[PDB]
């Protein structure tokens, strides 16, 4: 049976979309932190 495989791949793409959406929230904050740390 491959129904569990289809469920697993749907879960994988859903988790990828969710993690991308979560990362989109603090993208500018991470950029600002990187610029602050790198600059002397």
């Amino acid at each position: 049976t491959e129904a569990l495989l289809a469920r697993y791949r749907e879960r994988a793409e859903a988790e990828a979309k969710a993690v991308r959406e979560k990362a989109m929230a603090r993208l500018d904050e991470a950029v600002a932190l990187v610029l602050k740390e790198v600059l002397p």
């Binding site: 569990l4 994988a12 988790e15 990828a16 990362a23 904050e29 932190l33 002397p40």
Partner: protein
């Protein structure tokens, strides 16, 4: 049965890596715009000071010709030769007294040298 969770783990890892790569390219683009900043002479002077104090007895200092005038006073004060090289676009390089030991303080070098240490903080800020 396990192949599905391999797929899930690989998808999550690939998405996280792509997000980190997007962060890296965005910070690179932001960092490359520093020549237009009014404080660009200040930051280039600070990094040149760091390079000079990290290399005692530097024979010469090498930087971009547009970046050259911003460091003339510091070079005169420290008594170090000042040279121009368009290849080094946004950094300061010292030749060293013997010509063998060289120190480089480019912003891109600092970025891709500290990215490994900053990855954990970036990930914890993005999700954690």
């Amino acid at each position: 049965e396990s192949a599905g969770e391999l797929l899930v783990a690989t998808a999550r890892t690939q998405a996280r890596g792509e997000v980190l790569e997007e962060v890296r390219r965005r910070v690179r683009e932001a960092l490359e715009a520093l020549p237009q900043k009014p404080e660009w002479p200040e930051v280039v002077r600070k990094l040149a000071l760091e390079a000079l104090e990290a290399l005692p007895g530097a024979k010469a200092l090498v930087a971009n010709p547009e970046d050259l005038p911003h460091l003339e006073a510091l070079a005169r004060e420290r008594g170090v030769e000042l040279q121009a090289e368009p290849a080094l676009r946004l950094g300061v390089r010292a030749v060293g007294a013997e010509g063998k030991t060289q120190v480089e303080n480019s912003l891109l070098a600092r970025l891709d040298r500290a990215w490994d240490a900053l990855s954990s903080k970036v990930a914890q800020a993005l999700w954690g």
